[PDB]
Design a protein around this ligand. Structure first.
Ligand SMILES: Cc1ncc(COP(=O)(O)O)c(C=O)c1O
Ligand SMILES: Cc1ncc(COP(=O)(O)O)c(C=O)c1O
Lengths: 377, 377
């Protein structure tokens, strides 16, 4: 057997265009976070690395406002942490109620069915949110093991209020499972106060990091549920029975953690802890309000009712007579700015402007706006 | 609700010890690969990033010696790519035969059962390998849908010969599924010539990269099997029906790829293509032979029969009267060298010396040997 060199490409060292990433994700990581990746690795079970993990756990507890012991990073993107909440919480035949008001609601429906759930849904138009009474009626009707909601719907620009939801779930014996991929770091979240039982996020948005070290947490109620499973978790890579032994004191090998991505996450969290949560939320809200003003200035309208608008993701209506995809391509190629287009019920009807983490700054809006104006001429 | 700052750690910028990583994994990534992570991200669907992915696919085809279209990186460590082969190949009730001759054989048994397989095993003492006749007898007995083998058993130091195995599997209508986590880049592999149907590797060993961008491939026979599934793949993050649409021309969003880790993988593969496969295999074999000599020089013996010794992972016997764990701790703390200890049948009986990728160099052995001598005094 001789070596086949047909796909032996002769490449030059990496060169990539510069992009201001103002879409649904990923965002531009902070420069110090990128530098932290360029550090020699140590072993995934080296006491220094374990010390670093301990630091990531503490800082994730701070940033999410939880004291859950099982608060870790998953070695995968937001979808992996998402799937881990489903795999660890759902046993075949469990009734799982999903509030669907956007693309990620539908993804939750798909995932839950793959773990054998009896899937129930309630729906709102994309950009709208569920009331307490709507949720109560759905809990009455479906009597589910789990209620899943997306806190910050990246596909619609809406923030789902969660006050009273945990208490409501406790009345029905239901676990509360919440997507905070687009809220963590940029929108106030109080997981414990809200009685959330499983939550997940990502590293590439409010946290100002590269994708792939995705926050995950489980409450005591959620662990109790995991503990009574009749079968093993049907996902080996995401089985919290095993991951809990690596992140816990047993320090049992499960997988070789992505050393350099954890370096980056620890540095990203350090930067958030330095700024301070309150300040971070304030920055994101101030920046989004400037965005809304500049957009109004140039005659563009907003999709989502003011009260529920995400500071991290704004849906802007596409005017009649405007090709939304063409505008987005021209922004990318002529201006090096990424923005998102609409999906599903919002296909062709909105753009999606991300203002997250390191990109939540005035300079972002100041690049976007005159670029948008020139493209809309 | 006021903000709780109890876990708001006040940290200084990242500082980690230097370590020569000569254990089972991860290895020290090459400096240019680490530098490539420190580059601003672009979007996961930006044509420049898609171009980069196209490059990763071509170079993975070269390095693995396959022409499979579905050859990609999985956004997870070796365990994720491992699990993806199982999730995409196994339907409930499928008979799955695993050749268990080490720790990763047992992990395959565990995974397969979680996807509903009817799991069958054959066993060899750790450090030994299966013959063609042993495999034939097992295929006769179990008539399995899938035969799974570990090419390079990191827990034992043995290389499983695969010549004739694909032809044997075709006689029985069986798919061949192979772990190449510890062989890819450092040990000759000819996937297509060997008739392998699913394979997986990792990015942190022979490829000289950071963990988390793990090679995965499926043959046409394996895709045919996937295509006749009666149910969805029971793993959303690893479902090749969906990942195939991101890595293929449809370019449909599945997950936000770990941009900076793919930068690193593309650069790692570029470096291997520059060196050339033959040269890379030759380097690893020359370096391991120097290792064996220096170890003999200092009176240490080898566990594995010469013919099956891995160039990338050597099991060295622990002499009577020597505390293997204590030696390993002293190497780490007094000498900044990581080596592995034994597990399972080899607990307390072997150390495991990795010589992989960037660490497959004379300087590695030259650090290790006098350190080992001083520690053994
Ligand atoms: C609300 C929401 N949930 C889940 C995800 C999936 O995360 P990932 O793309 O990192 O896999 C995203 C993607 O950004 C998202 O916006
Ligand atoms: C043979 C083998 N298979 C699978 C794995 C799992 O890879 P990871 O630790 O990257 O999840 C390893 C770990 O190095 C291994 O040595």
């Amino acid at each position: 057997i001789s070596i086949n060199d047909n796909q032996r490409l002769q490449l030059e060292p990496l060169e990539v265009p510069s992009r201001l990433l103002l879409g649904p994700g990923p965002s531009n990581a902070h420069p110090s976070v990128l530098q932290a990746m360029n550090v020699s690795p140590v072993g995934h079970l080296d006491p220094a690395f374990l010390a670093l993990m301990d630091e990531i756990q503490s800082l994730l507890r701070y940033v999410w406002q939880t004291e859950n012991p099982l608060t870790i990073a998953v070695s995968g993107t937001g979808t992996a942490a998402m799937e881990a909440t489903i795999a660890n919480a759902v046993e075949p035949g469990d009734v799982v109620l999903i509030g669907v008001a956007g693309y990620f609601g539908n993804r939750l429906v798909d995932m839950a069915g793959r773990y054998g759930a009896d899937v129930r849904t309630i729906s709102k138009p994309w950009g709208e949110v569920f009331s307490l009474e709507e949720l109560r009626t759905a809990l009455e009707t479906h009597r589910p093991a789990i209620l899943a909601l997306v806190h910050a719907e990246t596909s619609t620009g809406a923030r789902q209020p969660l006050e009273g939801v945990g208490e409501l779930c406790r009345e029905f014996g239901t676990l509360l499972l919440v997507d905070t991929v687009t809220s963590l770091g940029g929108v106030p979240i109080f997981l414990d106060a809200w009685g959330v039982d499983l939550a997940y996020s990502c590293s590439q948005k409010g946290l100002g990091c590269s994708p792939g070290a995705s926050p995950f947490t489980m409450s005591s109620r959620a662990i109790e549920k995991l503990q009574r499973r009749r079968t093993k978790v049907a996902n080996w890579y995401l089985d919290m029975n095993l991951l809990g032994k690596y992140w816990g004191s047993e320090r049992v090998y499960h997988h070789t953690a992505p050393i350099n991505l954890y370096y980056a996450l620890r540095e990203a969290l350090r930067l958030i802890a330095q700024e301070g949560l309150a300040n971070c939320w304030q920055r994101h809200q101030k920046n989004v309000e400037y965005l809304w003003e500049r957009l109004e200035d140039i005659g563009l309208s907003l999709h989502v009712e003011k009260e529920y608008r995400l500071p991290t993701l704004t849906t802007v209506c596409i005017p009649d007579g405007v090709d939304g995809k063409a505008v987005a391509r021209r922004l990318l190629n002529e201006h090096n700015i990424e923005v998102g287009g609409g999906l599903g019920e919002l296909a062709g009807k909105v753009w999606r402007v991300g203002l997250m983490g390191f990109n939540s700054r005035k300079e972002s809006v100041d690049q976007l706006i005159p670029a948008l104006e020139q493209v809309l001429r």
